[PDB]
Ligand binder design. Structure first.
Ligand SMILES: O=P(O)(O)O[C@H]1[C@H](OP(=O)(O)O)[C@@H](OP(=O)(O)O)[C@H](OP(=O)(O)O)[C@H](OP(=O)(O)O)[C@H]1OP(=O)(O)O
Ligand SMILES: O=P(O)(O)O[C@H]1[C@H](OP(=O)(O)O)[C@@H](OP(=O)(O)O)[C@H](OP(=O)(O)O)[C@H](OP(=O)(O)O)[C@H]1OP(=O)(O)O
Ligand SMILES: [Ca+2]
Lengths: 387, 388
C-alpha cells in the first residue's frame, strides 16, 4: 500500500508558562505598572498550556494513525514511544501532557535527567569552543545579524506601553531608554550565546505579552490593552524574533551550540536506528529549535498565522517513510503548530480542523513536489552536521 | 476549614471521566431504535480526549485546593512517594488517573499504578459477587427486587420509546417486544459476576447512559438523542432509568457489602489501620458501581448532587479528609463528593478556587458531623473497622 510512516522524531519546545514578574525580575524592573497575576510561579507551565498540548497530542495521534503508524484505539507496542524532556518543570510538564493526550491510558513514561531544575547537556545550547577566533567570529556574526534589523519603531512603541522611563531600571539603575541603548553580545565559553541591553529586555517584555495573549487574558489585560492590531503584534515581535535570530541563528554559533541535540537526532534516526522507537518526542526550548534549524541548514521558512518564529506548542516533525526497501526510504520534515488564534482559543484540533503544517526543506536534501527527499541525502546531512 | 484546622491526609475515590458508550451495549442500542447512533472519536468504553481535558481541570482544581489547605506547596512537587495513584487496569481508568495526576502535579514524577494485564478487571475495582452460596443470592435477589420496587419508571420508559421511535426498532418490529413498561425485569447475582438485570431496565440504562455521554461530550443539540430532549425535566425523567439501574444493582446493603469488600478493605488500611505508613494523598480510579457500592457499604446518609442528573457523576470523586483540630486536640474526618456539574462537563469549564468544582458534604450514619461537616476520627474508625 505504498509509503507508510515508519519512524518519527518530534522536536518540541515547552507550551504556555507564567512570565517571571516577581520583585527584582527583569519584567518587574522594566515598568512601574503592575503585571496581571498568573496561576503558577514564573517559568512554570500553566494548565492551559497542558490542555493545548493535550490537543496537539490527540491531533498528532490521529495524524500518525492516518499515515499508517499505529492505529487509534490501541496502545502502541511497549517501548514503541520514547519521550525525553529537558529536566525543568515546564518541559517535563509539556511532555506529560502531550504524551497523555496522544497515548492516553498507555504506559509511556516521560524520561529526564536525574536532577530537576537544571539544564540537561542534551538541551543546553552552550559554546563548546574556547578559542578567541571562535569568540571573535561568533560576536561578529551576532552583531552582523543584529545590524540588519530596524528596531527603533518597536522600541519606541514598547517604551510607551511600559512607561519605561519611570521603571525601577531607570530610577535605580539609570537604565532609562530602550531605543537609544547599546546591545552587548557575548559568546562566552561554556555559556549560551547572549546579549544584554535593550534587546534582552525587549525580548522578555514582548514574550510576556505573547504569553498573556495565548493564556486567554482579556484584551484589557494583555499589555494593559495596548496591542490592538496584528500590525502592532508584528512590530513588537521583531524584538522577540530579533533576539532569537541574533543569538541562535548565525552559522558559526548554531553548529557548535546544537551539537548534542544534532548527535541525539542522528543516533535516533540514523546510526542507532535498529534500537530506536517508532516515535521519539524531545521537549526542549526555543533556542534548541532555532539553533537546530540553523545547524542542519534548512532553507528559509515562514509560518503563516503566527507571530513567533518558533511558536509555543510548535514542533519539528522529522518523518522516515518506508514502503519495501530501506534504500528507497523518504524523509519529510514539517513544522506543525497552532496558530496564534488556535492557541488563544484553545481550539480542539482534529483531521477536519488541523494544526497548521509547513513543510521544511534541508538545503542538503532537496524535496520533491510533496515535501519528500531521499533518506540517502538526509543521512549525509546528519553525518556531516554530527561531525 | 475552621481556625486552627489543618488538613493532613486525603483519599480521593474517583470515577473515570468522560468515555464513549460501552462497547458491550452496542447491540442493545442497535436493537432499540431504527435511528443512527452518532459516532465517537474512540472505541466504546475508552476515555475521550475531552474526558482528558475535563480531568486535567479536576486535577488542577484539587491541586489548588490542596495548596489552599497547606497539603502541598504552590510551585513545587510533593515529596517522593507522598502521592499514591492506583487505577483499575482499563484504558479509561488509567487514562483518567494520568490526566488527573498531570493536571494536579504537572512536571512531577508521580506514577499511575495498575495491575499489568490491561483490559482485565483488577479485583480491587471489580464489583463482583464473591460469594457462591445459594443463600447469599436469595437475600440479594430480593434486596435488588425490593430497591427496584421503590422506583416508578413507567413515564421514563414511555418517554424513551417516544424519543427513539422504539415502535420501529428491531426489538419491536422483529422480536415483537413492543413496550418497555409492560416488560419485566430479572435480576441476577452470579458468582464472580457483577450483580445484573436482564430486561427493559438494562435497555433504559444503556440508552440513557449514551444520551448523557453525548451531552457531556458536546455533540451538537440535534445529535444528542437526535435532538429529542428539550427540557431539563425530560432529562430528569430519563435519568431515573440510569440511576434506577445503578441503585437496583449496587445499592442494596446485602449486595453492596459483598461487592465493595476489596475497596472497603483498601480504604480501611490507608485511612485507619496502616495509616501511619500511608501516603498523605491517595487517588484510586475506578467505576460508578464502585462508588455506589462503597457508599452503601459504609452506610452513608442519603445525598443530593446539585447541578447533576447522575448519582455518581462522570469524573466525580469521594474525597475523604483527615484533619487535625490543633485548638481542641482532636482528629476529624470530613468527606465530600467533588464533581463537575452537567454544564461544566459540556462546556469544558476551566476549574479553580475562583470557579470551583461542585462540592457536597457527605455524612456517615456511624459518624455524625458537626455544623461544619466534621465528625470524630474514632467514630470514623469504628465504621471503617466494623465494615472491613
Ligand atoms: O534554556 P534555553 O534553551 O535558552 O531556553 C529557555 C527559554 O525557552 P522556552 O521559552 O522555549 O522554554 C527562553 O525563552 P525566551 O525568553 O528566549 O522566549 C530563555 O528565556 P527565559 O530566561 O525568559 O526563559 C531561557 O534562556 P537561558 O537558558 O539562557 O536563560 C531558557 O530558560 P531556562 O533558563 O529555564 O532554560
Ligand atoms: O464494569 P465496571 O468495572 O463497572 O466498569 C465499566 C462501567 O463504568 P464507568 O463508566 O464508571 O467506568 C460500567 O457501566 P456504567 O455503570 O458506567 O454504565 C460497567 O457495567 P454496566 O455495563 O453494567 O453499567 C461495565 O462492565 P460490564 O459491561 O462487564 O458489566 C464496565 O465497562 P467495560 O465495558 O469497558 O468493561
Ligand atoms: Ca536599529
Amino acid at each position: 500500500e505504498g509509503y507508510q510512516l515508519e519512524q518519527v522524531l518530534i522536536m518540541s519546545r515547552a507550551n504556555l508558562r507564567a512570565p517571571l514578574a516577581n520583585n527584582g525580575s527583569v519584567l518587574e524592573q522594566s515598568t512601574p505598572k503592575q503585571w496581571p497575576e498568573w496561576e503558577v510561579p514564573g517559568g512554570q507551565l500553566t494548565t492551559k498550556g497542558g490542555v493545548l498540548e493535550v490537543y496537539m497530542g490527540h491531533y498528532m495521534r490521529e495524524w500518525l494513525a492516518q499515515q499508517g503508524m499505529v492505529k487509534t484505539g490501541e496502545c502502541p507496542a511497549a517501548d514503541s514511544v520514547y519521550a525525553y524532556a529537558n529536566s525543568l518543570q515546564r518541559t517535563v510538564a509539556t511532555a506529560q501532557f502531550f504524551i497523555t493526550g496522544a497515548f492516553p491510558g498507555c504506559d509511556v513514561p516521560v524520561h529526564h535527567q536525574e536532577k530537576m531544575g537544571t539544564m540537561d547537556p542534551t538541551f543546553n545550547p552552550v559554546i563548546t569552543d574556547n578559542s578567541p577566533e571562535f569568540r571573535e567570529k561568533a560576536l561578529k556574526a551576532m552583531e552582523t545579524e543584529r545590524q540588519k534589523m530596524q528596531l527603533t519603531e518597536s522600541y519606541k512603541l514598547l517604551e510607551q506601553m511600559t512607561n519605561y522611563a519611570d521603571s525601577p531600571s531607570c530610577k535605580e539603575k539609570k537604565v532609562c531608554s530602550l531605543a537609544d541603548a547599546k546591545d552587548t553580545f557575548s559568546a562566552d565559553y561554556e555559556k549560551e550565546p547572549g546579549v544584554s541591553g535593550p534587546l534582552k529586555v525587549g525580548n522578555s517584555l514582548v514574550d510576556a505579552f505573547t504569553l498573556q495573549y495565548y493564556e486567554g487574558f482579556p484584551a484589557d489585560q494583555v499589555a494593559w490593552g495596548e496591542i490592538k492590531t496584528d500590525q502592532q503584534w508584528r512590530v513588537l515581535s521583531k524584538l522577540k524574533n530579533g533576539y532569537q535570530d541574533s543569538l541562535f541563528t548565525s552559522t558559526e554559533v548554531a553548529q557548535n551550540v546544537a551539537k548534542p541535540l544534532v548527535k541525539y537526532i542522528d543516533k535516533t534516526l540514523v546510526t542507532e536506528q535498529a534500537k530506536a522507537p517508532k516515535i521519539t518526542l524531545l521537549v526542549g526550548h526555543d533556542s534548541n529549535i532555532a539553533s537546530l534549524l540553523t545547524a542542519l541548514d534548512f532553507k528559509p521558512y515562514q509560518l503563516h498565522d503566527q507571530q513567533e518564529r518558533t511558536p509555543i506548542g510548535g514542533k519539528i516533525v522529522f518523518q522516515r517513510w518506508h514502503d519495501k526497501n530501506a534504500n528507497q526510504e523518504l524523509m519529510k520534515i514539517e513544522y506543525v503548530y497552532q496558530s496564534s488564534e488556535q492557541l488563544r482559543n484553545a481550539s480542539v484540533l482534529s483531521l477536519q480542523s488541523p494544526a497548521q503544517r509547513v513543510t521544511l526543506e534541508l538545503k542538503g536534501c532537496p524535496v520533491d513536489a510533496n515535501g519528500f527527499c531521499p533518506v540517502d541525502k538526509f543521512n549525509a546531512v546528519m553525518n556531516n552536521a554530527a561531525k
